[PDB]
Amino acid sequence: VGYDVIVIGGGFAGVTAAREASRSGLKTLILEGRSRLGGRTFTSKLQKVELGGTWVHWTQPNVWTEIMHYGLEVEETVGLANPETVIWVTEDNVKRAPAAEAFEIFGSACNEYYKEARNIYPRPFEPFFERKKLQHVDGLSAADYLEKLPLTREQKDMMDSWLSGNGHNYPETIAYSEIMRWFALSNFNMPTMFDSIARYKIKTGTHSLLEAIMADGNSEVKLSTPVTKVNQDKDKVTVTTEDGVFTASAVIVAVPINTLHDIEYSPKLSAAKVDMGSQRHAGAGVKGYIRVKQNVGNVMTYAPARNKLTPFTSVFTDHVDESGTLLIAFSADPKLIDINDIKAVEKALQPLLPGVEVTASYGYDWNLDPFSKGTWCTYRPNQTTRYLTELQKREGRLFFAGSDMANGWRGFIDGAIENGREVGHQVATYLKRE
Amino acid sequence: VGYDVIVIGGGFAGVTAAREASRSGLKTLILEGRSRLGGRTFTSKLQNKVELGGTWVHWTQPNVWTEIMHYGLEVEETVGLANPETVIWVTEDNVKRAPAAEAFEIFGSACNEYYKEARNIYPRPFEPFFERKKLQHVDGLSAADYLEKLPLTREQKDMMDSWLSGNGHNYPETIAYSEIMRWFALSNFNMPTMFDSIARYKIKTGTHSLLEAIMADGNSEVKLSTPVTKVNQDKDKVTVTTEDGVFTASAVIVAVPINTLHDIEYSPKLSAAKVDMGSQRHAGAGVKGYIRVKQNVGNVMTYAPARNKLTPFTSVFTDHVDESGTLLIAFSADPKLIDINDIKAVEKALQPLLPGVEVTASYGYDWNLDPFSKGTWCTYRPNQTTRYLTELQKREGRLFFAGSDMANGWRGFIDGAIENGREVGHQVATYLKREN
Ligand SMILES: Cc1cc2nc3c(=O)[nH]c(=O)nc-3n(C[C@H](O)[C@H](O)[C@H](O)COP(=O)(O)OP(=O)(O)OC[C@H]3O[C@@H](n4cnc5c(N)ncnc54)[C@H](O)[C@@H]3O)c2cc1C
Ligand SMILES: Cc1cc2nc3c(=O)[nH]c(=O)nc-3n(C[C@H](O)[C@H](O)[C@H](O)COP(=O)(O)OP(=O)(O)OC[C@H]3O[C@@H](n4cnc5c(N)ncnc54)[C@H](O)[C@@H]3O)c2cc1C
């Protein structure tokens, strides 16, 4: 064998696993399909901006541990956690109110929608602590549950906006239990949830953290080297790529679950990987940055995934400077809006911010990038209880890792780091046992 | 030089630092004065397994929770403090008892007033001086100073006194108000999460199991029962003198409790912050003990102010109830008030809180008189945060410093030790790599 460990995928999961493995003394190679590391995090420059994963918080043990580990610093996005004005669409009409006034409505709705989170996920990092209680509800979509609640249509519409934002899809495709999971990870507190999901970002960019972790390790890296076949025998794994064939005692498959079909495995992978590679998680929407000429202040908008007025489930202020306001925008379906068509985005903004002039608009297409085939991972109904454990399971000398199968903040950067660290430790232990 | 890194102290901070450094390829030696690793964590047996020091953890604690998951460890629950059935409390020399919810009405109203400014002082609890000016304005207050300015009943004030004395492990006028604020801010500004964070979850296999996993993931030599006496540094090396040998390294990580700083002779002498903290000490100076009573008392939680005429204990709560009766955890603000290892004295002291209990067993480790700790967990006195934290953390030549006593976040906790040790170990690895 040429290597002790080969890691397929150079996202945070694969990089963290490679650090764990190499620092334990194992000869490790990273094979990365793109011409860059980072995967679904991508720090670039527009005119330095984050084209993918962005926000972090100290409710996320691993990513915060690493940030402090390397002396990085964080800045604030203002719009979601501390807006001045809240705009929301209900029954195809647009309402606007002081943030406190809007959050009365939205928070009462939340009190209703999250009432069972404590019963389902008392230990958010131990998914199956309440296996029976979770199994009883895992068949519910976010919409299925919403419609059972005693709320006004307005409350339901705000919750629709919120849940569609969380799952990055229409609410009937997103698992209700996953919504509960987010709430429980935020210490069963709505303010803590807002602070955790869209407020703090690494001052020097996610790439700086990724690089600190890589420098802390001792792994070889081959970029622009897509893996095509993985063959496993009793002694080794043979990983075939477009640019060479490599052998290792153990291989950590750290690719997006939505891409599992894209490699030929012998033996074939278990039915859980096959089923999730077929169905995919729910993350399949649009995220974009919009520069507007006007100074609109700190706004937060809510619109149902399906409404007659705007394609955006939410838009909010990132920051306001001399050039106007930078907004972050989410939509549940790229069929609704071309986030890179400036005139289309401007039109889509008119009902929420009448009169805004779009100076610029950009969004990376994670859905059609063959190396992601989607955005951040949120399970569809039934997927947690059916597949999580089966997804994590090692198969022979093949190990599996990623936020897409993390126990806690699955779907976040923190999930990638947590899962990669544990899986790398397991791989090192396995090799020591032999 | 004999080593790249010598780590003085085999607590969680030093153990984490030693892992960080050795896994970076550096030849690392740990020197530990006691005959064991763990420092102020000590997993022992009381009639066959108890934690005599650091015990409770939570996922609001990034480093220790990261490590717990890293190694696949599990947690159990202490029931008494976070989910009692009955709360007993002492106010104005009276003892009241009520269903937990009723007691928490009073205690929670008091808390709502006492913590109202935490958000303004520590918006980023892991970044101590983010709001430096606001913190400097209040850092001169003791917990008692602030309490007496509040619009509360004497009952509310007495419950708050109990709580603040429990947190600081000392009398409330010795504890910094800002430190109380920090605990609240680290608990995400909500009392339920604070209760869950400070006394609820414990590692099923004991703190030593995590300490051992960290050590096994590393590659460092260990010398136990080898107290350091002198540390001398020049431009090229550090010479560390112990009772059992002399060792040299390019860099030395000093990971001892600040309360012990005076006990090693440093040449050149250390900066004024280290000396001032070794003189003044943090506030942690109380009693912690395990008590077995024959009776099944249920899940109780008690509150008594640090100075009261009824009992020496600031709080007692149920750890668990099994066939042998009730195991309770007891805290006192002053070792002069109760001999935690005198069974009859403890039984007497418990009578007003749990009238009729028969004490079958009682044990508490004396961290105050142990020369290797000289105190319990670190909570700063007034002024100490803003005057000393940064200078305490400062590297001096080839000397680096680490410990829970100087962490940015959960300072005073296991999480703080792991966090600070990781940062300092990474800094040492960087420094030594640069020299090559
Ligand atoms: C639009 C968007 C916004 C987000 N915002 C946030 C946020 O604010 N906060 C947050 O915490 N998270 C956010 N996330 C989620 C976060 O970015 C990801 O969950 C995390 O980066 C996933 O890391 P990973 O290592 O598990 O997988 P990935 O990052 O997807 O890494 C997988 C890697 O494998 C490579 N690969 C795939 N197939 C092959 C192959 N055959 N051969 C070789 N290499 C291959 C890919 O190129 C990629 O480099 C966001 C995600 C999206 C899509
Ligand atoms: C009673 C009590 C209860 C606690 N409960 C909790 C809890 O529930 N949860 C929590 O998170 N934290 C708790 N803590 C705090 C926690 O135990 C400590 O904060 C943490 O262990 C600090 O570790 P450290 O590595 O920074 O220093 P320490 O663990 O104190 O160890 C420093 C080491 O230096 C060694 N040393 C000292 N002098 C010398 C010398 N001259 N030569 C060589 N070695 C030397 C010591 O022997 C020791 O091993 C508690 C503390 C106490 C006292």
Author numbering:
A (entry chain A): 13 to 59, 62 to 448
B (entry chain D): 13 to 60, 62 to 449
Give verbatim lines from the article.
The first two steps in the pathway are catalyzed by the enzymes nicotine oxidoreductase (NicA2) and pseudooxynicotine amine oxidase (Pnao), which convert nicotine into pseudooxynicotine (Pon) and Pon into 3-succinoylsemialdehyde-pyridine, respectively. Both NicA2 and Pnao are members of the widespread flavin-dependent amine oxidase enzyme family. Enzymes of this family use a flavin adenine dinucleotide (FAD) prosthetic group to accept a hydride from their amine containing substrate, forming an oxidized product and reduced flavin hydroquinone (FADH2) in the reductive half reaction. However, our lab recently demonstrated that NicA2 is instead a dehydrogenase that uses a cytochrome c protein (called CycN) as a biological oxidant.
The crystal structure of Pnao was solved at 2.60 Å resolution. The structure of the Pnao monomer has a similar overall architecture as NicA2 (39% identity, RMSD of 1.5 Å), firmly placing Pnao in the flavoprotein amine oxidase enzyme family. The asymmetric unit indicated that Pnao exists as a homodimer with a similar dimer interface as NicA2. Overlaying the Pnao structure with the nicotine-bound structure of NicA2 reveals that the substrate binding pocket in Pnao is considerably deeper than that in NicA2 due to a replacement of Trp364 in NicA2 with Ser372 in Pnao. Trp364 forms the backstop of NicA2’s substrate binding site and forms hydrophobic interactions with the pyridine ring of nicotine; replacing it with Ser372 in Pnao allows for a more extended substrate binding cavity that is presumably better able to accommodate the more extended Pon substrate relative to nicotine. In Pnao, the aromatic cage residues are Trp434 and Phe470, which are more typical residues that compose the aromatic cage in this enzyme family. Several of the aromatic residues in the substrate binding site of NicA2 (Trp108, Tyr214, and Trp434) are the same or similar in Pnao (Trp113, Trp220, and Trp434) and may promote the hydrophobicity of the “aromatic cage” commonly found in flavoprotein amine oxidases. Ser372 is appropriate positioned to form a hydrogen bond with the pyridine nitrogen of Pon, and the deeper substrate binding pocket due to the presence of Ser372 may allow aromatic stacking of Trp220 with the pyridine ring of Pon in Pnao. However, the isoalloxazine is buried in both NicA2 and Pnao, with the C7–C8 edge of the isoalloxazine >10 Å away from the protein surface in both enzymes. Our structure of Pnao contained oxidized FAD, and it therefore remains possible that a change in conformation occurs upon reduction to the semiquinone that occludes the isoalloxazine from the solvent and reduction by dithionite.
